[PDB]
């Protein structure tokens, strides 16, 4: 690809720090071993959830081309993807996977500076391009990247 060979090589040992066994891939137990070695204790569910955060093919195992896309978000300073995502996670108070208009009125009307509900209705109307009556995460991501 576009990456130079020296840079390919220096990312290879960083990948090797994940594939400690040299299995050709990254597994769940290997990653949890690293997590424990760095002083934090997730569950298998939390590890699996962070896999689901990162697993593009849908295998549960990670390879080097996925790993490059992974570190592409991490090498920069501000993961603007992650910042929008976790702010969305703040919004879903019910864990629905959605932002309802009731959650929207709970947040923006009282807290903030007095945005009118009819303007919030126009916001929700331009917002639900999926027409879901509410905001998805895909709708939210496309919405913030609109």
Partner 1 sequence: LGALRRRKRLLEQEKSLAGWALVLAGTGIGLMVLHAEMLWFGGCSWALYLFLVKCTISISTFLLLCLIVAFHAKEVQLFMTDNGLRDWRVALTGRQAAQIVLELVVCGLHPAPVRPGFLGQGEALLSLAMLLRLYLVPRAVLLRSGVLLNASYRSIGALNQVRFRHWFVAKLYMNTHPGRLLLGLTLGLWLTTAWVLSVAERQAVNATGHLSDTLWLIPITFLTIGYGDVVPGTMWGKIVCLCTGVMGVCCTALLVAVVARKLEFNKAEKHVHNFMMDIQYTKEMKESAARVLQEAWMFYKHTRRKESHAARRHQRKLLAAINAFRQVRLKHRKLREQVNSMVDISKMHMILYDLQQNLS
Annotated binding site for Ca(2+): 19, 21, 23, 25, 30, 55, 57, 59, 61, 66, 92, 94, 96, 98, 103, 128, 130, 132, 134, 139
137 lines the binding site for partner 1 (CB under 8 A): no
- Look-up: residue for tokens 């592409």? 72
Residue 133: C-alpha distances to residues 116, 119, 120 (Å): 19, 16, 13
CA distance 50 to 107: 28
Residues at the binding site are 19, 21, 23, 25, 30, 55, 57, 59, 61, 66, 92, 94, 96, 98, 103, 128, 130, 132, 134, 139
119 lines the binding site for Ca ion (CB under 5 A): no
Residue 18: C-alpha distances to residues 62, 71, 116 (Å): 10, 13, 50
Q: Could you tell me if 61 and 19 are in contact, meaning their C-beta atoms sit under 8 angstroms apart?
A: no
Count residues binding partner 1 (CB under 8 A): 43
45 lines the binding site for partner 1 (CB under 8 A): no
- Tokens for 23? 């299995």
**Selected range binding partner 1 among 21-29, 52-60, 76-84, rule: CB under 8 A:** 76-84
107 lines the binding site for partner 1 (CB under 8 A): yes
């Amino acid at each position: 690809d576009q990456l130079t060979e020296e840079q390919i090589a220096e990312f290879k040992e960083a990948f090797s720090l994940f594939d400690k066994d040299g299995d050709g891939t990254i597994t769940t137990k290997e990653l949890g071993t690293v997590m424990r070695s760095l002083g934090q204790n997730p569950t298998e569910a939390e590890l699996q959830d962070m896999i689901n955060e990162v697993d593009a093919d849908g295998n549960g195992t990670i390879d080097f081309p996925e790993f490059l896309t992974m570190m592409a978000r991490k090498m920069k300073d501000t993961d603007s993807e992650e910042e929008i995502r976790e702010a969305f996670r703040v919004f879903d108070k019910d864990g629905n996977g959605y932002i309802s208009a009731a959650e929207l009125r709970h947040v923006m009307t009282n807290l903030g500076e007095k945005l009118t509900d009819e303007e919030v209705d126009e916001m929700i109307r331009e917002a639900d391009i999926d027409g879901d009556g509410q905001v998805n995460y895909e709708e939210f991501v496309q919405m913030m990247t609109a």
